[model samples]
Target chain A: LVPRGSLTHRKFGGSGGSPFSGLSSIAVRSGSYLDAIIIDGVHHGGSGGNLSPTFTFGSGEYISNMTIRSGDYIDNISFETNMGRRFGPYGGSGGSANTLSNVKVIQINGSAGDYLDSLDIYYEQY
Target chain B: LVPRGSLTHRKFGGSGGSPFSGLSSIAVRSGSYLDAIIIDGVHHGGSGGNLSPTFTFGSGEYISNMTIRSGDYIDNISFETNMGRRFGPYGGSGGSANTLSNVKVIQINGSAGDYLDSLDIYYEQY
Candidate 1:
């Protein structure tokens, strides 16, 4: 899987097996934050795991562009977190297929008050 | 000039200037009608003359995907007519720059009871 973004550029899985198994879900803490995560897995491996970076930013902060495109994923981009829902984490977000000229986000992780997901994120934002 | 549409494909003016001069005005008699016209003239020669076609479609009748792009025009497309206004005639008609997927129009001209212009037209509708 490949999560395309300026903040995060990660590739997961391997030749023998995939990092993510089936479908996946993720949570995001946004706020002037810029981040990204990619998941690659097979049906028996399990999708979504603790394999992404974390991000935290203040107000007026911006994350120019974010993208999440994985081979085995059902959709090009997915947002399953609260921030993703608010910003349309589902399909047809209208943010993909174009350069994210300028934008930003703000949020707080429910678990540890972090700004971004220290674990896995199955989406993109720009 | 050329009026791009399935119903109309016309070229106006001559080799000297354009078929249209400065800014021009037009009156469209819409309603189940399909017509078009092209005006090609120079600035000093005069713009918008009697050389285009006319069109008038009814409700639910569609003119999908239209485009108006000329070298001499200020903007790629300009519509100085009532029907153009309703469909954003002046500039940025949204109909242009894309294929005429599916659409229609309907109207009436005040001067005569014609569905299209027997004169010139400085726009395109598909």
Candidate 2:
């Protein structure tokens, strides 16, 4: 799995405007399939949206080409498990061994939107 | 692996002061081990510090109760196998099948400090 946050701008006037922020809005966790994910676009804790930081899959549940908005709040987009995945306060469940590729993020006007993407594995199982 | 971001405050006078941003500063990736990880504590890309989100481990590395300062800006804390593991811009290689557990993040003075925590995995392995 790969994560990328784009630092772009809305470009209402120039680069540094009122809301001069652009970011990547796509996250995926492959090779491990979860029930579903949640997306929140409220901009809590800085940047958030209706998406799951944890991407799960079944067999061929490939996640790609998913577009999202950039904001400063957080909400749940999918809820397939109950594992409390990032973005998911409730959580979800699923299988293991999935794949995540082509997971890219873009900015509105190319400012500072993209942040950091990472991968993590839990010791707990379903 | 679970990721939780708490918002706290670094109170100098009381709660609402100049810098009242408390957060959890401990991330761990178990089972897997890499060469080394680097940390940056300057304050670039928002929250700058010397830590890593992708926690890699050797055998019996068992990461527990790691205390880190809470602030803004981000830096490359650890560098095992790059793959751009969120913190690392360079690429590093590592083993698959790692474990992450007991990752308890707390806030200082019980204020708005903790941000958000997450877990991710990649297919690209060494």
Candidate 3:
């Protein structure tokens, strides 16, 4: 499992056998805080099949702050199988895809006293 | 002027003399209901300059209901000149761009007895 906001200019692929399987390509471990995690979607990865790349938040992990400033900005993050689209953590079931942008506070695992700080999303002339 | 959610598949442009000036290309007049007002942004108009194309809400006008699935969704609407980016209504001054998507309720003119209902934004992979 890669640490949140750790992989800046790199890419990694995996299958069911791969340890990173079932886990988000990027994650926030328990009790960890991520300032800014920027992902440039120009990396090579899955063929848009088999539960492709995702961003997960481990129990107690918190994205204290995050910013996504236009980098082939495509919705690839998912919570569960066939869940809602768009980036950001998905609520239990029937929850809308809350695009993670400029969120005041966000708790990864829905734990108490665990939340993120200010989040922002701004682009020039997309 | 045209009532809110009136035009669907048509393109209309104007200059300083056009009656639609200073007003939104779409709007919610006093006491009205719009289930879904979808705009296909593939129209011919200004070259992305001037205070072109906006979405306004007259006093007491409320978006009791609205939904925008998808249709060349471009950032054309503006509350004020260079206020902020993104499509949606802008607050007073130095307010964030509240993208009008899946809103529980929205009061156009910021009046009391005004609000929307069950807004949803879901598509098959944007």
Q: List fnat, each candidate.
A: 0.00, 0.00, 0.00
All candidates: TM-score of chain A: 0.24, 0.19, 0.19
Query: How many steric overlaps are in each model, in order?
Result: 62, 103, 4
What does candidate 3's lDDT look like per residue over B1-126, in tens digits? 333322111111111111111112243211122112221121122222222244543322322323222222212222222222233321112212233332212111111112211112211111
Native contacts retained by model 1, as a fraction? Answer: 0.00
Cα error, residue B27 of model 1, in Å, equals 60
Q: Which segments of model 3 are wrong by more than 4 Å?
A: A1-31, A37-78, A81-126, B1-126
Give each prediction's DockQ, rounded to 2 decimals.
0.01, 0.02, 0.01
lDDT of 1 by residue, B1-126 (tens): 211121221111112211111112222212222222211111111123323333322222322333333211211222322333323232322222322222221111111112111211212232
Q: Kindly list the per-residue Cα lDDT of model 1 for residues A1-126, writing each as its tens digit.
A: 112121221111112211111112223322222222221110111233323222322222323333432221212222223333222232322222322222221111111111111222111232
Clashing pairs in 3: A102-A119, B24-B54, B102-B119, B106-B116
Worst 10 residues of 3 chain B by lDDT: B7-16
Order of models, best TM-score first: 2, 3, 1
The superposed Cα distance between candidate 2 and the true structure at residue A79, in angstroms, equals 7.6
iRMS of each prediction in angstroms? Answer: 31.1, 21.1, 24.5
RMSD (CA, Å), each prediction:
24.6, 20.7, 22.1
lDDT ranking, high to low:
1, 3, 2
**Cα lDDT for residue B24, model 1?**
21
